[PDB]
């Protein structure tokens, strides 16, 4: 039951306990999972009285590539438990690439506990600084509207979707947020760019009680507000005559919007007045709900570029930096959320998992053995090595963070990063350039409709016969179906190399199926990756999915705003 002072005391207690509970985190990760075949190669049985030493001396580090095949055995027909154990309820993808390729990572309900607790606690300290109303609501640009089942018949999953469509998300977050402005069905709507539109709409609805605007990322916010600049007059028109715009097509979300609407002319006057009264839309956020204590989201690392345009958006309002963790292992909390984005830092909460760091101290890089999290040095730059409940054990996530200080007994962390970038030689690509080329080439058909293509991804299906390619796009707008068929036809037609030509001209590999997905889809990908526990070197996107990439994939199937197989071929 969420309170402010008791949890923080337990958390001060906890954070000072950082060693006992880091060590106990390790006990628990292997006591629950003594059974890993990975560890049998290592020769592990648990207990003992050199347990931490036996772990840091007998298990080798592992990389995305060596980690690909085992969790790959989990997901595809063999429903088999492996590196951690349990045939998990969801699986991951990872920013950067596993030799250009896919990286799988297991999800367990434990990680959901980790979620809630980080979020009761992070919210405690924030409302301790940025206090809210308990009868109000929030502008949260959060989506999780997509949910597939892997080719193995097992679900596999993104952070956000695995959070929000989870059974305990709704009961557990009820006391730690201000009630979400949008129906769950439009949060979970098959058309999410339209839902983004009905998310502005929704967050704009109960604006008076809203205590903050939320995206995980400033670019999430910045795309929400530049989008607002595009469509505000239309939004007036939507809610105005009690008739949602013809732009809206998907039935359930349409029934939900009509479930809220009647003809109401009075408020257009007001909104038109304020909206045309501003200077190129500076301070639009306090302009919207003027009683927000904050704008929230991550504000360090590769999004620092997005603080200004969003600062232009946020006006004078305080930008609070969001904490730092993920499915692959959550890392830290900002228990002093009042600090500026430029100085913002996130303190490591100790039952997250079992983390060691690889110090860069020497030159670049330097051949040093790991030291514990409180054996780490202040001001120095180390790369995060991860052990948790999510398929990861002393793993190299490959990304660099600085210690700026200590919140009592736990070290505080700074992200000056962007990319875990070096790659290697691929095979999902169909040339990446081709993939992107294919996106672009087909896209301008959409661009006829005054839009540009904001993002794109893809996947290969060997469940089917013939196995087929799946293209996913993110755009700024909705459009009728004919062009989308024309569009799928061109992704089929835009891979310039002789090979692709051979396969689908004969028909041994399937025609390409373009499932165009919605807005924020890849923002989800960015937003769940940079905050992901390790260091901002996470920004990315792998552009094509072997069976062994998963996170992008939870976000892939359900929101077929349109999914079309080529009527060509």
């Amino acid at each position: 039951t969420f309170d402010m002072n008791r949890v923080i005391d337990e958390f001060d207690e906890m954070t000072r306990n950082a060693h006992q509970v880091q060590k106990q985190t390790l006990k628990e990760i292997l006591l629950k999972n003594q059974s890993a075949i990975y560890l049998q190669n290592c020769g592990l049985n648990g207990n003992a009285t050199d347990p931490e030493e036996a772990f840091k001396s007998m298990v080798p580090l592992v990389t995305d590539v060596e980690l690909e095949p085992y969790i790959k055995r989990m997901v595809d027909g063999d429903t088999s438990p492996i590196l951690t154990g349990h045939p998990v309820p969801a699986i991951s993808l990872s920013s950067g690439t596993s030799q250009g390729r896919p990286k799988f990572i297991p999800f367990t309900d434990e990680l959901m506990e980790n979620t809630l607790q980080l979020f009761r606690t992070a919210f405690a300290f924030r409302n301790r600084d940025f206090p809210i109303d308990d009868n109000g609501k929030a502008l949260q640009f959060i989506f999780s509207s997509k949910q597939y089942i892997s080719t193995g018949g097992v679900p596999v999953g993104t952070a956000t979707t695995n959070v929000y469509r989870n059974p305990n998300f709704k009961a557990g977050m009820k006391s730690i947020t201000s009630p979400s402005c949008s129906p769950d069905e439009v949060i979970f709507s098959p058309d999410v760019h339209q839902a983004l539109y009905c998310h502005l709409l929704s967050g704009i609805l109960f604006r008076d009680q809203v205590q903050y605007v939320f995206a995980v990322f400033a670019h999430g916010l910045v795309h929400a507000f530049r989008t607002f600049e595009q469509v505000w007059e239309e939004i007036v028109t939507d809610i105005k005559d009690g008739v949602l715009s013809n732009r809206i097509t998907v039935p359930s979300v349409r029934t939900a919007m009509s479930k809220l609407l009647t003809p109401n002319p009075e408020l257009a006057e007001t909104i038109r007045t304020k909206c045309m009264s501003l200077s190129n839309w500076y301070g639009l956020i306090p302009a919207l709900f003027p009683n927000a204590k904050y704008v929230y989201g991550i504000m360090t690392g590769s999004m620092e570029p997005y603080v200004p345009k969003l600062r232009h958006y946020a006006g004078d309002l305080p930008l609070v930096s969001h904490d730092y963790g993920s499915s692959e292992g959550w890392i830290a909390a900002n228990v002093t959320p009042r600090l500026s984005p430029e100085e913002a830092t996130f303190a490591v909460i100790p039952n997250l998992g079992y983390f060691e760091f690889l110090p860069v101290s020497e030159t670049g890089e330097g051949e040093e053995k790991p030291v514990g999290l409180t054996q780490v040095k202040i001001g120095e730059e180390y790369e995060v090595v991860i052990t948790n409940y999510a398929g990861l054990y002393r793993y190299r996530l490959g990304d660099v963070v600085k210690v700026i200080g200590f919140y009592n007994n736990t070290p505080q962390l700074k992200f000056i990063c962007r990319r875990n970038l070096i790659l290697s030689i691929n095979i999902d690509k169909n040339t990446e350039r081709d993939l992107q080329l294919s996106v672009e080439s087909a896209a301008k058909r959409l661009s006829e409709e005054k839009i540009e293509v904001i993002d794109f991804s893809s996947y290969i299906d060997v469940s089917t016969d013939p196995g087929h390619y799946a293209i996913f796009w993110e755009i700024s707008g909705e459009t009728n179906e004919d062009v989308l068929q024309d569009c799928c036809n061109c992704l089929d037609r835009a891979f310039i190399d002789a090979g692709y030509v051979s396969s689908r001209k004969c028909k041994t590999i399937g025609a390409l199926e373009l499932r165009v997905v919605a807005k924020g889809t890849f923002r989800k990908i960015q937003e769940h990756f940079l905050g992901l526990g390790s260091s901002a070197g996470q920004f990315k996107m792998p552009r094509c999915v072997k069976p062994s990439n998963a996170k992008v994939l939870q976000i892939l199937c359900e929101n077929v705003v349109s999914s079309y197989f080529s009527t060509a071929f």
């Binding site: 080329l437 672009e440 080439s441 087909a442 301008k444 058909r445 661009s447 006829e448 409709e449 005054k450 009728n480 004919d482 062009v483 068929q485 024309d486 569009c487 036809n489 061109c490 089929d492 037609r493 835009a494 080529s566 009527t567 060509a568």
Partner: protein
């Protein structure tokens, strides 16, 4: 500089813009109010008063398929549209002339006329796109191994394809996919990717015509 006298809904006008941008000449566009044809236009073509018109060295070059020939010949050193053989050149003028007859007129019927008139040009355009799709057969394009002459000729028609599928209440892709297919393929070139208006507005211009004559 080359001055173009164009009109935003002109598939023809677009043939010239695409033609000019394809080769790689920087040029200025001028928007025609055909209610008020401008003094340099009525001095370019005093009787037709038709566009696109390209003024080079104080000389007006008019008729669109002519203008793209002119585009070719004006700068003969980089991107040719014809192949080196005379016959393939003859092919590309032939099929360009195919584009200019039943095909143009059928589409004119389909977004311009209704009823008894409508279904004729409705069966005309599919037959047109069907011979079209046969003759495309394999080539990424039409009048060369690369972006050719008539590639420019009918690519500018692919922004009206929305207006056709809507008034026509059709879907010209299931009957013949590979064409509209090749069209958005061709859209990647900045010759047509910057030289063609938004299709929804085209749809709105057809809509204006449609509401005006009923």
């Amino acid at each position: 500089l080359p001055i173009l006298l164009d009109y935003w809904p002109s598939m023809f006008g677009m043939r010239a813009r695409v033609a000019l941008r394809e080769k790689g000449v920087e040029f200025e566009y001028r928007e025609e109010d055909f209610s008020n044809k401008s003094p340099l236009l009525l001095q370019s073509n005093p009787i037709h008063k038709k566009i696109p018109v390209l003024v080079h060295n104080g000389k007006p070059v008019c008729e669109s398929l002519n203008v793209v020939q002119y585009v070719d010949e004006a700068w003969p050193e980089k991107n040719p549209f014809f192949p080196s053989d005379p016959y393939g050149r003859a092919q590309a003028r032939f099929w360009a002339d195919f584009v200019d007859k039943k095909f143009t007129d059928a589409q004119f019927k389909v977004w311009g006329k209704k009823g008894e008139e409508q279904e004729a040009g409705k069966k005309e355009f599919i037959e047109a796109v069907k011979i079209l799709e046969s003759e495309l057969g394999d080539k990424p394009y039409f009048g060369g191994d690369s972006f050719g002459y008539v590639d420019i000729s009918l690519i500018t028609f692919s922004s009206w394809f929305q207006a056709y599928e809507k008034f026509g209440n059709f879907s010209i892709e299931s009957e013949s996919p590979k064409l509209i297919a090749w069209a958005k393929r061709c859209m990647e070139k900045e010759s047509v990717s910057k030289s063609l208006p938004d299709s929804e507005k085209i749809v709105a211009y057809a809509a204006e015509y449609r509401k005006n004559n009923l």
